Structures are given as C-alpha cells and as structure tokens.
Amino acid sequence: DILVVAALGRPFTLGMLYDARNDKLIESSQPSSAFEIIASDSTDDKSSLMDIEASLKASFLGGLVEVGGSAKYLNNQKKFKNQSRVTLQYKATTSFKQATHVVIGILYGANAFFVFDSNKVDSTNVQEIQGQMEAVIKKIPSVTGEETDITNSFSCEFHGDFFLTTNPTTFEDAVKTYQQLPQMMAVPMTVWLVPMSTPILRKVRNTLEAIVQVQMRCNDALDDPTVNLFTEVQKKLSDFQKICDDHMSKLQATIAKKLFAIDEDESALLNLFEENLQSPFNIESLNMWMEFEEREINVLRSCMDILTKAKPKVIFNQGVLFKGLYDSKVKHALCYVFTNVTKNDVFLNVLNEFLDSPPKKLRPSPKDYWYSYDDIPETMREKAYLFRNLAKEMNNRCVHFFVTAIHNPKQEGAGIHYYRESIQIIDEFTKPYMPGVESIKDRRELQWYDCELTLDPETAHQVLTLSEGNKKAVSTKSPTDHLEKFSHFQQVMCTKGLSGRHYWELEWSGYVGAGVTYKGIGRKTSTSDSSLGKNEKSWLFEYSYQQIHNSKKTRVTVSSTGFKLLGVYLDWPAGTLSFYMVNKAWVTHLHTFHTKFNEAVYPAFLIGVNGQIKLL
Amino acid sequence: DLVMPALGRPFTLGMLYDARREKLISSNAQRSSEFKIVASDSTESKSSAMDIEASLGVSFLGGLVEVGGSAKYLNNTKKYQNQSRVTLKYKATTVYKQFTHVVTSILYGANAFFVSDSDKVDIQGKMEAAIKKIPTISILTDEEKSLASNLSCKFHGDFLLESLPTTFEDAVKTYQTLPTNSVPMKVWLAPNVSKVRRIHTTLEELHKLKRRANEAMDVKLVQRIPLIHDKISNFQQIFQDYMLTVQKKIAEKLPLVREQSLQKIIDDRAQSPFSNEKVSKWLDAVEREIAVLKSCAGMVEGTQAKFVSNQTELDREVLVGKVKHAVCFIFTSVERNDPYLKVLSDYWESSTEDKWCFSTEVVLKMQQRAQTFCDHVNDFEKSRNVGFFITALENGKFQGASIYYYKEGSLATQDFTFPRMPFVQGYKKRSDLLWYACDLTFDRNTINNWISLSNDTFAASEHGKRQNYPKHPERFVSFNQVLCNEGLMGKHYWEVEWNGYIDVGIAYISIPRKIDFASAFGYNTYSWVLSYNPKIGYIERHKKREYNVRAPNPGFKRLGLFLDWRYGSISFYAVSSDEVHHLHTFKTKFTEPVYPAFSIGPAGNHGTLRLL
C-alpha cells in the first residue's frame, strides 16, 4: 500500500530507500502559495503546520527523525514558560516529479518560519502582548506609532528552505526578508513511496511534552536576578535541568528502540510509562520541586529587597568580602549573612538515585527545606529591617554594611555579623552597647556615630575666613552680609541640625569655643541672646578651658594644656554633650554636659587672640 | 468512466489510482474564467464548491486523500460559531488533455478561494452583498466600505503569488491579477449511501463540540485562571486525540468495504464516555463554572485588586515589605485534576448532579463573600499597606471561594471576614493601625512663608532668610502653620517624626489663613491639635481651651495619629518600633472633611515635622 510522508528538509531523491520506522537509508507543475500565523509551539501545533502524520510525529519525538532546513523549526523550543511566541509561516509548493519502501514520486516546494519571541514577561501580561504580536505580525504580508514600540519588544528567528545571506532578527528585517521570499523560488516537501497505536502515540507525546514544560519553568527561575546572586540556588536549578535532560534522553532511547519493534508486543513500552507514573519522576513531583525552589527564591528575594534599601555592599564572594571587610577605612563592619542556603537537596538526590539505580520519596517533602514555612523567613525579614535601621542611623565614613551568604548549621536563617578590623567580634549584633560617655577611652566606640560637618557660610562672621569646602575657618572683615549672619560675636554654625547620636572631631588652635545651639539664638545682638553659652539655648566649651551654659562658666582640668585634635560626641536623646582630647587610637574624656535638649542642636563655633578650626 | 475533482494532488496522463483514494505512481484549449459565492462553510457547501462526490467525500473524512493549493479550503474550518463566513470562489478552466483505475483525460486549470470572515461580535447576507461586487469592481458605498474594512481574508489557490491578500482591498487587486504554469482541475478515471450521512452527521456533531470548547476557551477570565484554562486545554487535546481515533477507524475500514464495521465506530461513541450527551453535559458544567467565577471576579474589576496565577505569584505579592495586610479572594472549588477528563484519558489508553457551581447555597454564599471582599477593596482604597488579590487555589476545606489573609508576608487565615480591632484607646500593636495607614503630603498653597518644605514630606521652620511662596488666599500669612492636601472623610492613620515646639492635629478647610484668634490651631471651633512645648510639656487645644496631657516618655521622636471621622475620635500614640503606647484620645463632632494641620512654633522657638 502506498503512503505519503513529509520530507522535513531531509534530502530526498527520485529513487531511494526508506524504513517505515522513519529512518531514511542513504516534472509536473503544482504551484501553490499560502501563509499561516500561530500563537502556539506545542509539538501538536508544529505538526499541524507541517502536516506531519501521527507515525512520523511519534518517531520525531522519539528522536529517530533528523530534520533539514526550515523543518529545523521543530527543534526551536520556547525558552521560557511566561513568554509570548507568535510564529509566521510562509508555505509554497512549485512542481512534482516521478528498509521497507522505495520513493516513487515527490512534491517540490519550499517554506519559511518567522519565529517571533517576546522577552520574559509576567504571567498576567503574556496574553495581552501575544495578541499585540499577532496583530502586527498579521500586518507583515503587505508588499504605526505605539505599534512600532511593540515591534521592538520582540526578536525574530528564521528557519527557511531559502539560502539567505543575512537572517532577520528584527521585525523590520522580517518584512524586508518576507518581501524578497516570493522571488527566491525548492526542496522536496511531500514524498510518495511504495512497499517492496493511538494509546502509545498519546503516551509518547504526553510524557515528553510534560518534561519540556517543566524545563521552561526551570528556565524562568534561572533567569531570576536573586538566582544569579545565590550560587547554591543557581547550582540546584542547573542540577534539576541536567536531571531532566538525562531523564528525557533515557526515555527517548527506550522509545526509539521499542518503537522500532512494531516482532514485540507493545506491552513493554506501555510498562515504561506505567512505571514512570509510579516513579519520583512523575510530573507532579518534578513540578512540586520546582514550586519548592520557587518558594526559596521568594523568601531570599523578600529579604534582599528589604536590605537593598539600606544601600549595602552586596558581596557574595568570600574572597572579595573579607578583603573588603579588612580594609583600612572600615572601622566597624556590619554583615547580613544568609546562613541556611545550601546546594544539597534531598529530592534532587532521590531523582539522581532513580536515574542511576531504578527510593526515599516519590514527592519532595516540605520537611526537607528551611524556607517551606513562615517562622524562619519571618525572623529573617526581622533581622533585615533591624540591619536597615542600623544602616540608617549609622550612615557614615566609619561603619560599613555588607550582604553575603555563609552557610552555617549552628545559625538559623540569617545573622547580623560584626567584624572590626581583622576579627569577628559577634555573630548576632543588635546594638553597639555604648559605654558611659565620661568613661570612653576607645576612639572606635565614638566613631560608631561618625558625623561629617561643613560650616554654614551664611552664619559665619565677616572676620572669619572659610576655606577647604567650609571645613577650615580662620579668624580683616568681608563686605558680604546675611540675615542669618553673626554680626557682633565671632560665631559660625554648621548646616546640619542634629537629633540623635553624632560624633564630630576638629583641629583647633587658639581661643576657639566649640559647642551646640538651637537656631533660636539671636544673630544680631551684643547681648546674652546671641553669644554661645549665655543662652538657655546654647552650650559651649572654649579655651582661654571653660564650660559655658546659662551664662554660667566653670573650669575644666586638662593635663595636656595645648592640644590640636578635639572630639565632640552628642547623645541628643540621653541629653549629653561630651568633650574629648583626641590622640591617635585613644581618647581622653574632658567634660560632659547633662541637660535636656528641647530642639535639634546645630554644632557651632566661636573664633577670636585669633583661631582656626579644621573640621574632619 | 469515473470523474472526480482533481484536488491539489498532482495528476499525469496514464497514472494509476486506487478506490482507497490513494494514487499509485490530443489537447483542445478551453480558456474561461468565472466565479461563485459560497455563503455556507458546511462540509457539504465546501464539497458543492469543489464538486466533491460521495466516494471522495467519505474518503476525505477518513483523511486518506492529500489536498493542495485551492483544496486547502476544505481543511479551513470555522473556529467560532459566532463568526460569519462568506467565500468567493474563482475558477479558471484553460486546457483539456485527452488519451484499480487509470487516468485517460485530465482537465488543466487553476482556481482560488477568498475566505472572508467577520469579527467574533443579519451580517451573513450583508457580507455576500459586498463580496458579490469583487468581480464587478476594480479598487462602492461608505457603509459598504466600513463593513469590508472589518473583514479578514484568507487565500487558498493554485497560484504562486508576489503578494498574499489579507485585506478586502488586497483581495480585489489580487483577483484582478489572478487571470495573468497550470494544474489539473478535473480528472477522468477508467479501470453505501445509507452510512455516508450517518458518518457525516457523527463528524459534524463532533466538530460542533470542538467549536463549543474553543468558544469556552476565548474568555478573558479563562486566560486569567490557569486552573480553568488548563482544564479546557486538556479537554481540547483529549477530544482532538479522540477525533483522530475515529477518523483512523473510518480510514482503516473504508478500503475493506470498497458496512456494519463502519456502524461499529458510530455505536461505540454512543456507548463510550465520549457520547454527545456525556461530552455536552461536561461542557455545560465547565461553562457554568466560568459563569459563576465571572460573576464574582467581575465585581473587583476596575479596582486596585490584582489577579495572580499561582501560589508562587501570590507569595511574591504578599511577601513585599510594603504589603503589611493582604486579603486575597480565592476560588477553592475548581479542581486541579478533572475526574471526568481522567475517564476520557483512561478510555483512550485501553456526575455533574452535585457539582459546586450547581448549588444554590454554595453559589449564594460565595457571591455574598465576593461582595464582602469588594467592600474591603473600596473601604481600604487609600490604605498604602493593604493589598488586594485574586487567584484560584483548589482547597478542600472551602466550597466555591474563600478570603485568605496574609499578615506581614505570613498566612494568618484561609477564611477572613473582617479585621478585628480594639476600641481607639486600646491600640497596642502598630500592625492593626497599618490597615488605615495612608500617604500624606503638605499643601504648598497653605505653607507659611517662613516654613521650608522638602518631595513635600518634610517641614522645618527658618530662623531668618524667609522663603518665597506664591500669593494664594489659601495660605497662613502670620503663623508658622501648614495643612495637608488630603481631606479625610473616614478612618485614617498617619505617623510623624516631630521635634521642638510643634503641634499635630486636624482642621476644616473652612479655617482662617489670614494673626487672629480664629486662624490659630486650637483657638477655633474648626481646629483640634496635640501641642508639644518642651518648657511646659504636652497639651491638646480646641476652642481656645488647653488640656494637660501626660506623656510616659517625654521627648519621644515619633507620633502616631489615628482618626475615625464617622465617630468623633482622634487618638495619639507614642510609636516605639512595632508597638504603640496610647497617650490620649478625645471626641469631637466632625461636620465636614478633616485635614491634617500642623504648627511649627513662633519666635526663637522652632519645630521640625516629617510625614511618614
């Protein structure tokens, strides 16, 4: 009995051998033109366009059938699940000419596939963009505005029976190529040849299609930004795609071998499928694992999203991290460490164990993964918010914030690590636990709250000369004046108004008076209302060493009478303003003010019998 | 002699042929071109257009014959019953060549098909009236032109073209080009009518269900709900595989008969779970599911509620920092693995009575819940930390649908009705107040000349060097006061990081802006505030009256404020991280929309105020 088989780009000549187990052993005029657009890519859909018979399709799925140009479209798989794919097919037939079978007659033609793929999108917007694509692709067989935007949203991938110098990758390129196609008109398309089961077909397609579908799901995950940060996550997904590739290749080998048999009762092949449903390689289980890994991605992502807002240095490479941590400029280092992310997975091992030795489970268990429930991720999210808070109150030159992953079974979920210089001080930081201000000897302690200050030129007296970006100010008037200018007293304020824990240190030389004030201080008086310390709004510490507040001066004992570097530490909510002598790594306490700050205080100075201050 | 239409398949003189419609492998010129209009797309009309007989007809149903060019028109079937289809047949007979079966004479000629389809929205006769003119015109009413514009065209012909027609215009200029090698049109061959209709009846019945399934699939909601989509999708694939089994049975038995073996195929369908009554019944149930889900989902349309495809997506949405309260409306009764589609699959490899969507109680209670949900959506429209979503996740515990609730990224309940709250003085958990937490912004039209603003979320009073603000009647002329833009008509919560000499409160827009008793907060019948004067302490002001308020932690940086406009409540709390310490609450009758109002103090005494 005579049969008709689709050439599928396979080189066919007028008299040739063909085995009906679809291996191929190596002039009438029939003009026809047509085109078809499909918004699908299942094997059933690709088969429907290429008019592939159930038998040939099954042998193609089994991998027995190789393909030629244009038919290479069959081997063009959609990368992502959540991606719009609209294929345009131009199909033309030109002429007709005239193992188990011999070729008697063959129909000649040549077709082309314009495979248009959108970028990975959300699940909800795939239908909208698919319709949009169909619409503008429907316009292509014509020999735009917002529509133009869409044409630049998707790429093109061509599979043709025509020899092309340059292949289209653009919508513009596709129309340019499409316009040229009718002139380029030839390879055998349909083959006549003479001799010399519906449950298996469904089971072959359904089994293999299912795996393909899971591997697109895996790909969506791999394209995730959070996956690219967490290498152990990246590893597991790569391992799962390999497991599936190896599983599908195994099935295909048996299918191709047992398909040929059609001498053997098909019962054996049926059993492989029956066995597959009984195995942990059931699609419910493979998808269930995907779902678990998807959950891990969301808990790590939600954590990262919290942290990122603190603008930390996210170093996942231990080499770069510890060289970054142990830098000269890093006085205090605070790391948010992920302590549970692991490359090892119980179910992935079960799957590899079934591939090599055809187990512990047939389903992945929520009991094998930390990220399954809510308590561990919830406390991970808590430490994240705390980390961000510390980051907000410690946004300075001394304290540095990092994010990394260091697996440790003794710590759960994550932890806030505190490194100072070369060592790890604590693996679960919460507070610096600052000592009593009159008791501070270690400079680092105060540097937890490093405070950069620049002088406000509008407040500075005309006598004062400000330079080096308003960090240095020397005590010869200036013509310029302001409504916020200190007209009588030689005083200057900073731009920042402080309400917490701030530590600034300066270089001073002569008669300088350092302190804080409310902006309520008068600018234009030769009265108590405008001099620092003579107010109930101002605190001062000047050298001739006195402490002024509420027009009350008291002496302060200083062993090193003339010192260059001065340190000032404000603890606004506690109500203390401390003065220190700074020398190298150590700090000498000089005087502390125990009061109540009724407003945000502005660091201010009194200079001039001439002085200079260089803010650091 | 046996004459049959030469379908796209090639024919040569003296070529061998079989009655299983497979083919084993003087001329007097004709030259004539005419047309025909096929107003029906029925398998019979396709056959009438192409002069297909009973033997070839039945053979095409078994799919034994290979078609080509124009003959592809046979394969081209209506997807939706709702669309209207008129086809223009072009025919060109030109050369007649003469000499189980052998071809003695073959008529040569090419013909084309112009399949015109209307939108999915009598439109049948109106279309044929327009199409009738194609061979009469050469590139016609404004009304006719508008109909022609909304028609789609498909070309099926024995021509290799330089361009293919997609447009009516395109079909006209193509049709003009058509008469300018050639294929066999009709062939002459030289060596059961009772069942033909029964087989044709069986396949048209099956194609009716196929078209029904496709219509069911074309809904927007179906595409938004993967559980119902994958259901229809699976049925589509199963039913497609079944239609192949049946055609292969016909294709296998047809050569043999060339009778009751054919009837066996028909009788098996009626006795199988693939019965017209069985399949129809199921499609009646999936259609009712789509109907009920549409009724519920339709309620939340046009609001900030979001559809999500699965748990992975719902997780992402609820797990966001900002979404402190997430109430999701979920369809619990749509099954992940349809038991009837299992029967169908299990049949291929070898009871809707009590169905949820057919329950007065289930559908009524579910519709009541869908409304409860909508009420929250509209109520919590301006609540920045409350998120609304919709999905379908099969849950045995609930029938029809339920409301899941996620508190700070973690599932609280799968059966939510309302957020339970204490009375305004009993608020201890910050989370509870975040149900009503909204975004506030300073009104640049009221901001006093000496108050400097940020993004319009941070106010600090200047000591000297006053700010230039445009002249508006709405503006404080001689007070360090500012109002927000948001007029509050119900339950609202807002936090503020305050310092120095300041007050936080509310005021009617009908408050004076230009230095009198009537324009200062708490010295109106129109203003209520909690003032902080570090010198004295804390107090509340209204209608020139001051009231001493005890603050547990004096000088606390963050202040929490909750207003219930419907009752006359306004409460003040000390915000300490995730905990609230109620300071003082008070009652007042609020006649008109209430605006957050602030003072940042006079003279050397200064305030600082940041909206959070």
Side-chain angles (χ1 to χ4, degrees), chain B residues 83-119 121-125 127-144 146-161 163-257 259-276 278-329:
Chain B
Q83 77 196 10
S84 280
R85 190 176 256 190
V86 64
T87 316
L88 174 82
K89 183 200 170 191
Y90 164 86
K91 186 170 77 184
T93 172
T94 63
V95 178
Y96 178 65
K97 297 185 174 170
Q98 255 161 326
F99 179 75
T100 307
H101 285 80
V102 192
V103 284
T104 68
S105 58
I106 294 167
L107 187 154
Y108 287 78
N111 54 11
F113 282 105
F114 292 86
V115 201
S116 303
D117 272 298
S118 185
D119 294 334
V121 197
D122 187 29
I123 192 73
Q124 191 81 349
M127 270 199 324
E128 87 164 34
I131 303 294
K132 271 180 184 199
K133 291 174 175 75
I134 302 276
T136 296
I137 59 160
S138 308
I139 304 156
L140 186 76
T141 318
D142 272 322
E143 182 175 41
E144 284 179 323
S146 68
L147 183 131
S149 174
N150 291 117
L151 294 179
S152 176
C153 182
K154 181 67 201 275
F155 180 86
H156 298 129
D158 299 291
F159 310 91
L160 279 167
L161 287 91
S163 186
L164 288 159
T166 43
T167 306
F168 185 98
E169 288 183 355
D170 276 10
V172 180
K173 49 200 82 174
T174 282
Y175 194 86
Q176 305 294 282
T177 302
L178 281 186
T180 68
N181 313 152
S182 194
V183 296
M185 215 179 76
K186 211 193 200 190
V187 289
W188 285 254
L189 281 290
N192 52 342
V193 68
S194 315
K195 301 283 181 196
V196 177
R197 293 299 301 271
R198 279 167 192 249
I199 301 282
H200 265 65
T201 300
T202 300
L203 268 92
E204 68 194 74
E205 277 190 336
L206 287 169
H207 274 272
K208 280 164 207 294
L209 296 158
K210 189 205 220 213
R211 282 182 251 123
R212 192 195 193 175
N214 292 3
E215 260 287 316
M217 184 61 104
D218 193 41
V219 180
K220 192 196 191 291
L221 197 96
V222 170
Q223 309 301 345
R224 279 192 289 216
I225 300 161
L227 277 194
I228 196 79
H229 175 287
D230 292 0
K231 187 181 277 177
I232 304 157
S233 171
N234 194 24
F235 170 75
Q236 281 180 342
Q237 173 150 98
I238 293 155
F239 198 70
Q240 192 31 49
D241 290 355
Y242 180 66
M243 271 171 143
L244 298 195
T245 75
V246 170
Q247 95 167 320
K248 190 179 174 184
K249 273 155 167 252
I250 300 152
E252 197 180 49
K253 300 293 124 167
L254 234 31
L256 272 80
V257 169
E259 192 99 328
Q260 285 295 92
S261 36
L262 255 79
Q263 188 64 28
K264 221 266 176 181
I265 315 164
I266 309 168
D267 300 334
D268 289 9
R269 190 212 166 182
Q271 285 296 112
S272 70
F274 279 102
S275 310
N276 212 86
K278 255 98 165 186
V279 176
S280 175
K281 208 185 296 156
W282 185 79
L283 292 161
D284 281 307
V286 60
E287 272 162 352
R288 177 69 182 154
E289 279 188 304
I290 295 162
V292 172
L293 308 179
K294 217 186 269 226
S295 289
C296 301
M299 297 190 49
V300 310
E301 206 201 312
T303 61
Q304 228 189 324
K306 197 188 177 295
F307 260 88
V308 287
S309 314
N310 46 87
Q311 193 59 263
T312 287
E313 309 216 324
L314 176 57
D315 264 13
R316 178 154 181 174
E317 293 302 329
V318 296
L319 278 171
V320 198
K322 298 307 178 86
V323 193
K324 302 282 195 297
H325 307 285
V327 282
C328 173
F329 187 84

Side-chain angles (χ1 to χ4, degrees), chain A residues 29-145 147-175 177-256 259-312 314-321:
Chain A
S29 194
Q30 286 297 321
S32 167
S33 188
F35 89 93
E36 199 169 50
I37 308 168
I38 63 165
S40 284
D41 207 46
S42 82
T43 185
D44 273 343
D45 297 310
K46 304 212 212 220
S47 301
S48 296
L49 259 69
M50 294 162 157
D51 297 272
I52 302 162
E53 310 78 14
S55 33
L56 186 55
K57 189 185 89 194
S59 294
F60 171 78
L61 292 160
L64 295 151
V65 191
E66 215 195 303
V67 296
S70 164
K72 273 175 196 165
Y73 157 71
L74 273 157
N75 288 321
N76 185 349
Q77 208 63 244
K78 215 172 80 171
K79 194 179 190 189
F80 302 123
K81 170 182 264 179
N82 275 1
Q83 167 197 78
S84 166
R85 183 195 216 85
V86 180
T87 308
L88 165 62
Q89 172 204 44
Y90 166 85
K91 183 176 59 61
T93 190
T94 188
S95 63
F96 176 69
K97 292 191 273 182
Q98 59 183 317
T100 315
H101 294 74
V102 61
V103 174
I104 48 143
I106 44 184
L107 182 62
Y108 280 73
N111 59 26
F113 298 98
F114 295 80
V115 183
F116 301 96
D117 284 325
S118 153
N119 282 27
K120 187 186 82 172
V121 292
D122 189 73
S123 309
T124 65
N125 303 337
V126 56
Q127 218 59 36
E128 183 198 357
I129 200 149
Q130 198 187 76
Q132 276 174 31
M133 276 174 79
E134 283 183 85
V136 300
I137 287 146
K138 274 275 171 191
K139 294 214 187 296
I140 294 173
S142 315
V143 186
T144 303
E147 290 171 350
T148 305
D149 287 318
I150 299 121
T151 68
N152 283 317
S153 297
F154 55 91
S155 75
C156 176
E157 201 192 340
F158 180 85
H159 314 291
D161 278 315
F162 313 145
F163 315 91
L164 264 75
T165 53
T166 46
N167 290 56
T169 42
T170 319
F171 182 96
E172 287 191 348
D173 289 23
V175 314
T177 295
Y178 186 79
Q179 192 180 310
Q180 300 323 291
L181 309 178
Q183 273 76 46
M184 293 187 179
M185 293 302 293
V187 178
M189 301 295 303
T190 303
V191 179
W192 278 256
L193 43 108
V194 171
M196 296 175 69
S197 176
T198 184
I200 65 106
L201 302 168
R202 168 159 164 84
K203 263 164 172 190
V204 162
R205 177 205 64 204
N206 270 99
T207 304
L208 292 195
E209 235 179 23
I211 290 113
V212 173
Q213 280 160 7
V214 167
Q215 264 162 314
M216 289 180 292
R217 188 179 183 170
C218 187
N219 287 357
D220 276 356
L222 278 148
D223 194 80
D224 200 273
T226 283
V227 173
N228 271 255
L229 285 201
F230 293 86
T231 69
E232 311 301 289
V233 169
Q234 209 157 358
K235 283 158 193 184
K236 271 180 291 200
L237 292 169
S238 281
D239 278 316
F240 182 75
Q241 87 184 350
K242 182 207 134 283
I243 283 170
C244 295
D245 278 329
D246 293 351
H247 170 56
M248 196 170 180
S249 78
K250 225 194 186 82
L251 287 154
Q252 275 176 16
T254 310
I255 305 307
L259 228 46
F260 185 98
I262 57 164
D263 63 27
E264 148 126 68
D265 177 26
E266 77 178 7
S267 48
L269 185 65
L270 299 178
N271 202 68
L272 187 89
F273 297 124
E274 193 187 346
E275 270 195 17
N276 208 26
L277 302 191
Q278 298 177 290
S279 71
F281 269 108
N282 191 10
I283 211 68
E284 300 213 357
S285 312
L286 297 177
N287 276 299
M288 201 170 289
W289 185 78
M290 259 324 298
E291 232 191 320
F292 274 122
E293 202 42 64
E294 285 172 3
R295 167 70 177 173
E296 184 169 41
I297 292 151
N298 278 320
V299 309
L300 298 162
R301 197 211 295 294
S302 74
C303 278
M304 282 298 317
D305 288 335
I306 294 172
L307 304 171
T308 294
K309 285 179 75 188
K311 300 292 287 181
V314 183
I315 314 142
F316 277 92
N317 195 8
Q318 302 317 302
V320 195
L321 174 76

Side-chain angles (χ1 to χ4, degrees), chain A residues 554-572:
Chain A
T554 309
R555 215 191 183 183
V556 315
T557 302
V558 184
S559 301
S560 304
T561 62
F563 63 90
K564 189 193 191 181
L565 185 49
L566 170 86
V568 182
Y569 173 65
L570 181 82
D571 191 340
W572 194 96

